[PDB]
Amino acid sequence: VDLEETGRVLSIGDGIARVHGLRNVQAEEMVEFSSGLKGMSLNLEPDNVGVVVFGNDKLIKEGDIVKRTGAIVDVPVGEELLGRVVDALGNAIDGKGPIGSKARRRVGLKAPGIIPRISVREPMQTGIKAVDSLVPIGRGQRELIIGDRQTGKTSIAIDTIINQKRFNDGTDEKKKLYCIYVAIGQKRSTVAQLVKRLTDADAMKYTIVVSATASDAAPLQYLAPYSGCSMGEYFRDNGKHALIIYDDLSKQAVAYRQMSLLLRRPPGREAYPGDVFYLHSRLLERAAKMNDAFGGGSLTALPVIETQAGDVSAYIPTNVISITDGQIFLETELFYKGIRPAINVGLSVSRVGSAAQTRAMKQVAGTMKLELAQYREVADAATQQLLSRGVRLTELLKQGQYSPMAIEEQVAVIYAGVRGYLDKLEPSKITKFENAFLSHVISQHQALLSKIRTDGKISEESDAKLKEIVTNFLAGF
Amino acid sequence: KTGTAEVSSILEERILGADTSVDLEETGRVLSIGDGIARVHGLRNVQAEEMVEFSSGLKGMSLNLEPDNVGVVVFGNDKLIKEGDIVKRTGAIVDVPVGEELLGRVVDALGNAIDGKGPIGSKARRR
Amino acid sequence: FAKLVRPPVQIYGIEGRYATALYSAASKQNKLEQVEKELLRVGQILKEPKMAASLLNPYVKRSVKVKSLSDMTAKEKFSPLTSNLINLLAENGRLTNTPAVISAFSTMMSVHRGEVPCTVTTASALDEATLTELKTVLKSFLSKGQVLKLEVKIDPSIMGGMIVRIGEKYVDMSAKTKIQKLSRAMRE
Amino acid sequence: TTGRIVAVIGAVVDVQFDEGLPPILNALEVQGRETRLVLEVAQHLGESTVRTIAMDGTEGLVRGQKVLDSGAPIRIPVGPETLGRIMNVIGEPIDERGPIKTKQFAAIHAEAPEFVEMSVEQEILVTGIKVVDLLAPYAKGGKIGLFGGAGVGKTVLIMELINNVAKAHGGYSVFAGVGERTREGNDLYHEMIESGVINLKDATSKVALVYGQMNEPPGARARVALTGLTVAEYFRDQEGQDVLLFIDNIFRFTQAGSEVSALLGRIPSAVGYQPTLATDMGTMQERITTTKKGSITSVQAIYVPADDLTDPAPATTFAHLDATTVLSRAIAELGIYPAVDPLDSTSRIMDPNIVGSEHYDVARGVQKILQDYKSLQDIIAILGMDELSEEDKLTVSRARKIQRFLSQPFQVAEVFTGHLGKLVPLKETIKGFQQILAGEYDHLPEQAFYMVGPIEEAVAKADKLAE
Amino acid sequence: TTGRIVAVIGAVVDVQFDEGLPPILNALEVQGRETRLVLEVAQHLGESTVRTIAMDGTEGLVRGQKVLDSGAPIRIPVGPETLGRIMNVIGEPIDERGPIKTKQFAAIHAEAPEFVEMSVEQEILVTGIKVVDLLAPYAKGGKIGLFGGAGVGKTVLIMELINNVAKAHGGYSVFAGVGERTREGNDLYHEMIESGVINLKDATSKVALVYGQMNEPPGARARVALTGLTVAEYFRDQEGQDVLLFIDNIFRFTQAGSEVSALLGRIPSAVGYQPTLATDMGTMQERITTTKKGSITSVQAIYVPADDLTDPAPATTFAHLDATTVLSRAIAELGIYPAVDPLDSTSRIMDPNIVGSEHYDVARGVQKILQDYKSLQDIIAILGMDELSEEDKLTVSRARKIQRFLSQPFQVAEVFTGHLGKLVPLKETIKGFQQILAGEYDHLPEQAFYMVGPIEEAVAKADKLAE
Ligand SMILES: Nc1ncnc2c1ncn2[C@@H]1O[C@H](COP(=O)(O)OP(=O)(O)OP(=O)(O)O)[C@@H](O)[C@H]1O
Ligand SMILES: Nc1ncnc2c1ncn2[C@@H]1O[C@H](COP(=O)(O)OP(=O)(O)O)[C@@H](O)[C@H]1O
Numbered sequence A: 001v002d003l004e005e006t007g008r009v010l011s012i013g014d015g016i017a018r019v020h021g022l023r024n025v026q027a028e029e030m031v032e033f034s035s036g037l038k039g040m041s042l043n044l045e046p047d048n049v050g051v052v053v054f055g056n057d058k059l060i061k062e063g064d065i066v067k068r069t070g071a072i073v074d075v076p077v078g079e080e081l082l083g084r085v086v087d088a089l090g091n092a093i094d095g096k097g098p099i100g101s102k103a104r105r106r107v108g109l110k111a112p113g114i115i116p117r118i119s120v121r122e123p124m125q126t127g128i129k130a131v132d133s134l135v136p137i138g139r140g141q142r143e144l145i146i147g148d149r150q151t152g153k154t155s156i157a158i159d160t161i162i163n164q165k166r167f168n169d170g171t172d173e174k175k176k177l178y179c180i181y182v183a184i185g186q187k188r189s190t191v192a193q194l195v196k197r198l199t200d201a202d203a204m205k206y207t208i209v210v211s212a213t214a215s216d217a218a219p220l221q222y223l224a225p226y227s228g229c230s231m232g233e234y235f236r237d238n239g240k241h242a243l244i245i246y247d248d249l250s251k252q253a254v255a256y257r258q259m260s261l262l263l264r265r266p267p268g269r270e271a272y273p274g275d276v277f278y279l280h281s282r283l284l285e286r287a288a289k290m291n292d293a294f295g296g297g298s299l300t301a302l303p304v305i306e307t308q309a310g311d312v313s314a315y316i317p318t319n320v321i322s323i324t325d326g327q328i329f330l331e332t333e334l335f336y337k338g339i340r341p342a343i344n345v346g347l348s349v350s351r352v353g354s355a356a357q358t359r360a361m362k363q364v365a366g367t368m369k370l371e372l373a374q375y376r377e378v379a380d381a382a383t384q385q386l387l388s389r390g391v392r393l394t395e396l397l398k399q400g401q402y403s404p405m406a407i408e409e410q411v412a413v414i415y416a417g418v419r420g421y422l423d424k425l426e427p428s429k430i431t432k433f434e435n436a437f438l439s440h441v442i443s444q445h446q447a448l449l450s451k452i453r454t455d456g457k458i459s460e461e462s463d464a465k466l467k468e469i470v471t472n473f474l475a476g477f
Numbered sequence B: 001k002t003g004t005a006e007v008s009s010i011l012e013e014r015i016l017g018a019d020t021s022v023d024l025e026e027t028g029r030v031l032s033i034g035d036g037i038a039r040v041h042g043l044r045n046v047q048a049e050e051m052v053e054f055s056s057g058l059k060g061m062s063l064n065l066e067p068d069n070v071g072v073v074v075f076g077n078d079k080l081i082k083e084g085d086i087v088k089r090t091g092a093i094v095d096v097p098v099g100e101e102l103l104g105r106v107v108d109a110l111g112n113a114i115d116g117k118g119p120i121g122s123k124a125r126r127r
Numbered sequence C: 001f002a003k004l005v006r007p008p009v010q011i012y013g014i015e016g017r018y019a020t021a022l023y024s025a026a027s028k029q030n031k032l033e034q035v036e037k038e039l040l041r042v043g044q045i046l047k048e049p050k051m052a053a054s055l056l057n058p059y060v061k062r063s064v065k066v067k068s069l070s071d072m073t074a075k076e077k078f079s080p081l082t083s084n085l086i087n088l089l090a091e092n093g094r095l096t097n098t099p100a101v102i103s104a105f106s107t108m109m110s111v112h113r114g115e116v117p118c119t120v121t122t123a124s125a126l127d128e129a130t131l132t133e134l135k136t137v138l139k140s141f142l143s144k145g146q147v148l149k150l151e152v153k154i155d156p157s158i159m160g161g162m163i164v165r166i167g168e169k170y171v172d173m174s175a176k177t178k179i180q181k182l183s184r185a186m187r188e
Numbered sequence D, E: 001t002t003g004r005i006v007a008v009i010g011a012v013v014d015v016q017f018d019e020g021l022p023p024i025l026n027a028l029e030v031q032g033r034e035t036r037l038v039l040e041v042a043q044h045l046g047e048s049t050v051r052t053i054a055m056d057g058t059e060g061l062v063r064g065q066k067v068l069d070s071g072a073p074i075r076i077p078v079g080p081e082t083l084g085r086i087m088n089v090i091g092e093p094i095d096e097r098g099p100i101k102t103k104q105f106a107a108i109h110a111e112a113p114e115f116v117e118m119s120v121e122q123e124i125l126v127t128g129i130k131v132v133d134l135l136a137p138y139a140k141g142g143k144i145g146l147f148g149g150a151g152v153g154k155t156v157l158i159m160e161l162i163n164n165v166a167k168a169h170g171g172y173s174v175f176a177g178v179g180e181r182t183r184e185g186n187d188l189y190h191e192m193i194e195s196g197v198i199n200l201k202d203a204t205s206k207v208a209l210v211y212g213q214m215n216e217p218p219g220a221r222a223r224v225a226l227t228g229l230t231v232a233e234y235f236r237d238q239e240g241q242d243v244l245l246f247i248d249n250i251f252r253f254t255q256a257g258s259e260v261s262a263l264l265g266r267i268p269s270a271v272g273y274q275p276t277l278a279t280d281m282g283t284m285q286e287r288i289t290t291t292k293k294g295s296i297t298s299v300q301a302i303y304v305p306a307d308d309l310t311d312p313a314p315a316t317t318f319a320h321l322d323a324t325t326v327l328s329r330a331i332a333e334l335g336i337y338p339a340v341d342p343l344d345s346t347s348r349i350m351d352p353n354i355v356g357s358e359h360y361d362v363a364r365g366v367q368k369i370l371q372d373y374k375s376l377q378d379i380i381a382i383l384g385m386d387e388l389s390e391e392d393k394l395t396v397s398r399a400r401k402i403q404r405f406l407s408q409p410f411q412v413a414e415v416f417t418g419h420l421g422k423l424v425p426l427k428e429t430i431k432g433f434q435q436i437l438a439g440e441y442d443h444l445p446e447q448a449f450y451m452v453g454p455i456e457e458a459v460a461k462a463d464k465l466a467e
């Protein structure tokens, strides 16, 4: 037997096979076991090779034949993946046929350096009033979504994905965003329901879904984020824009801790190895924004973290807060109370997207942010006014589910709210007024919203016409 | 890697064909002794949790049966046990006397009277 | 246990334990020279590319390896000591460090016949007369009956002089060390 | 294939197979044993040696005993003949009623249904219980956590769920007891026999029990949940119906996994749990789903160590739960039964997109009024009942009526309440609570709502007690 | 010489030389790679093997590959031609502007200055930040450390210090970004290009940049602090100038070590940390001293894991600094910015013989009142601020006024908040705190001091509040 391009599994167990042979196997190279699984050769040792199996170790046996594929761990990338679900290795799992991709990218490829990048200058629209007005997200940014169990983070991600359809249905190739959704250590039922929800919103034609659900071996959950990030780097390096949503990046950390402990590595703080920070920074440093000498493409990243009992100063939350360009703190208290999305605008910030915000939204959201900030500090006459306006705004930023808004409607609604037109309306009816007003402006006055969208600003004539519309409607309410 | 029975004494025995005059099925030779744990070579026919008896009158329970050796826990001070001793099977898992003959008697963990009131009746035994 | 006769030089490790067992076994029955010769023989016998390829594969069962080694030993008419040693190394799966065992026994037998390895290092080579007086004086260092095993390396890194190792004894009449000594003491 | 025991360290047994190695997870039978001993393979140490976790006491094993390779993982008898039969992890009956005769055997180590064998639409499991169906509906094919578990009605509630599900939808049920006290196991067997969910005579049972005793080695208490899943998966796939699977307790599942991991010699993770905690839980919880054929709805009893909700065990199990029920000692005191905490109970599918707008609005109104009454009770305790308004005394009355109506008489508790059990459909529950909230019944007495079925029973009770 | 790879585990590679062995810290080149892969030797394992740490990704290394000894440690280009450039661990330009043309290379592993070289001078460096200047006055030529968890203001503060100090600095400057965001390095590069501190088309650049950002393996993050240290050591010793050395984040230098220590077969210390934590930190940090040949005013941002100041890394770093500045997450949550904790922050030059008697007295009065307020806080939180004597209420009011007044608007945060950056000369700081302490401003509202420059701006704000 060829003891150079082939070896025999010395010892399986723990999901780390020890192979004997493969004398010409490169480090981090992908090998294929006889049964059908695949593995990655971490430890080129003098006498054996430590291969982590991307699958269930039950299928591997001592004596099996490992054959090196000859290439570093890589995944199929391209336009052919849009609309398909795939496992962590790029093999389709929705049973719609072979993936059929021409290009393969390494999952361990290095992030772009300091010269390729450029400041974030374009907005990534999420159709969530709170996110778009108070913590804007640019294109190329890395905006952590950090929360708890059932506080509405996957809802933010899916609202973003569904909202991108306004642009992916148009013709401007410079605004189309191709979304990617990586599901790690997450119930497969949820992934299937999410894929159906996307298909019902016609949001799969530009969405890839990478699955590493809880029934998948630890190495697959470890490797799914990198497969997704390569699938997105393809678009980034080809002058197109992409948006990848790792969900969650704490399940990946748990999987990596399993992998490390089973390899008998020195546990650190909370038994996590020392590489966890490197594990995540290696990943989130690829969400860049290339400059026009490199294509001008971008790759946004929306990592998701689940704190434990609201602890934001934990180990992994603090690592990813030290890696990312902002935060969206979803508070469980607010969510249970009734505020949804439950974004805690006090603690949620955006390092970069502030400059990428749209002018029309920028001017209105500036005064919205000042008013909310003032209200936050007082919770007589001026105090009563601040409480009233703050409650109006807070009830204004409540939103439904799977119903993203175009920027123009957000501008109209927030403008009505901040200019004090609702200062007399009872605080409970603000949502009803909002839903009626949106229908009104979306039915009759399309010219105004279209002009705002095209001009990209609330011009003085646009301001006057919007004033007229809101005052007349408030009169007829 | 390494085994605890790879000490040069066992290998010396086995090289010059001296391992055939020793009965390694019902007897063993203590390889190590320390902190109340003895590691014994041989006793190939010894059952888990069986009671073995050392040459110096002590007893022990064989808990760890590994490929190379048997890990016996000694029922007393390991002062009397020395490397090279001889350990013999008793053949039976540990059991204790039972019956109404124990009532009113102070006994130790193995059913031996320790109150100095005389032998213990003990018609029946139980594992 | 059997009071094994200790070797002169203690080799340590797995090879050390196997070699000490072999040396104790041979020293009684007095078969040290023959067993050393047989060890040198098996040094080449196992080295054969076919045998080496068939013994470094851990997927041939230990049964097959022991059977093949028994056949080879019978075909070579060895002492029972060496045959049992090879069988023991095969059962324990210690064949990959057999050459280590032979090397250990070689080191252990060399000291048995009274040899003290020596090393001489100089900037350049030596004239045979000077090497002869070196032999004489170094034999003066040794004790009675202790043959010498000279090795004369040439190290140009040193600037001259001589360096001599006799066992653990060491004498450094080299230019480099004296330059270092003067430079340091003078620097103080 | 035949191997030999080479080592025995506690509950871990290292075997040696000269001919050919069995794959991991196989089951090996030790030959020369007075009672069947099965070893599950877990590692391939090399040199043809395997390391196995024992499913029974390893005492009395010898280095050299022959071990026979079955060739497939633990295979248990599954079918309709397991209903009403207790059986341990390896499938041997332990109720001493003879062999479990079946024409089917299933391996307990299976894989979760593929991504295409998955229902894409949520559902609701109607259990016929007002509080469960209104404030915390049980998703079909979704895990439900059940808290409390001490003299509050956990067993009676489990039995009522079994009966209702076997009566409304006709599906059977499995009760996997992970680390079950033998005393409580026998008590539960007899309670089931009494209420009628098990029938020893006519073979019309509705539940198949699988007990992993509390004195079995750690390698057995870790796999009984898988035996229960296999027995339930037969009914899902082969019988094509909706099954219930009661796992009591799930914390004991995690504990047994942790002990096995430690015994095999693995470094513990955060709080001393196995490094494979998340995957050990996920491999099991991912087989409780709604395939396109049937479905398995699981009900884990859950224990929270140190009362810490962030401990890795419940922190990991809560990631899988699709609902929650909280039996409270404070409500069994009031005579309300089932003593389900209406406000602490939670559900993921309590969403207008899933349960419909009317159901969602009724549930939210009931929760709001109950919270209002809870807040008002402080004022009643401190400032006295007189301090209330007239738009608050009315809410107090309505909330008391709602609390009474949320109670129900169970069919498996007719020897505790003197009434006759009711299985209230969903529409009846929603209409009753909608009417009570609207105020249509403000003239009735509160006790007319206690322990009744649909609202019409409350009307009849009012007529019978007032006249 | 020529050796061959024998083992490749993570970033740790074993290389076997049959001929002469390379000494320790000596660098080797892996022959046969697309780019330059440098392996720094770290140990001799016997049997003519050396363990080494790779300064770049090790994917693609084949056992038996060839490695060529280089004869000297990693030698980087140093000189006045490394100003305005960007370098990496091994001295290769990464700005895509051409090779760094210098006539003189420096090994990054030099030894620390001897004892007869230290300088005892102790001046004061004015930074224009009220909290830093009053309580923890930075010193010229000393080491400064900004301790803080994630997202408390380390980089914003260090950029403010860059702006202020290195705009009024006639000497050179060196920013070594070790283990921080790559986009932060890009923003710094472009801010300097715009601000004139870098001329891409001239020879009047005054900042040398080195970058080992987080995306690089542990071997590059470990040894990138030494590259910046060498670039600064040249400008100190040879050029005999006064250098600024900003490091952000130095924790990533020790962290990276603990990533390779595990693979070097070393027993871990207190919390997974390498056994050699303090020795490595000492050998790195004693080369940043200001000797008699020149001066280095090093500012280091230090990350506190999980906000734990008891961690071995920050706890060990504390002993290597003149002035510390402990940014706190609680204070940042109160809105105060910079979040400097006035009581954890310290300094060596906070001596009446260096700063004065009014500066010293004011600093101690502020600290005393803040400590009294901290003592009261626990009671204030439960019993309420009504169960306080009048002296205690006065202390609370003054302490809150002082807490707010220590907050300041930075110019680097003009984009964040829209305010205008403010510098506050030392005399104005001392005068304002004197006035607040004496009680001259007890009639103002405490929110009149929030984020203002000198105190007269607080008075103007208070007047505007009245309207
Ligand atoms: N904007 C919203 N309005 C109303 N309800 C919402 C909103 N967002 C989320 N929810 C509710 O919150 C529940 C959980 O939402 P979601 O799955 O987004 O949270 P999650 O953090 O992803 O949950 P998990 O942590 O379990 O994955 C959903 O069932 C949904 O009904
Ligand atoms: N629907 C009900 N009607 C009457 N009594 C009930 C009902 N549900 C629970 N109980 C009471 O709760 C007690 C505990 O029951 P059970 O749950 O079987 O024990 P455990 O809580 O220990 O499992 C019983 O004594 C029973 O009287």
Ligand SMILES: Nc1ncnc2c1ncn2[C@@H]1O[C@H](COP(=O)(O)OP(=O)(O)O)[C@@H](O)[C@H]1O
Binding pocket: A321, A322, A349, A351, E148, E149, E150, E151, E152, E153, E154, E155, E156, E157, E337, E338, E408, E409, E410, E413, E416, E417
């Ligand atoms: N002078 C300031 N004004 C307002 N906000 C500030 C100021 N300094 C720091 N911050 C806060 O600090 C955050 C940036 O944290 P940063 O220091 O970049 O993180 P790290 O501590 O990881 O370096 C900003 O989002 C901002 O809210």
Ligand SMILES: [Mg+2]
Binding pocket: A153, A154, A155
């Ligand atoms: Mg989610």
Ligand SMILES: [Mg+2]
Binding pocket: E154, E155, E156, E180
């Ligand atoms: Mg920073």
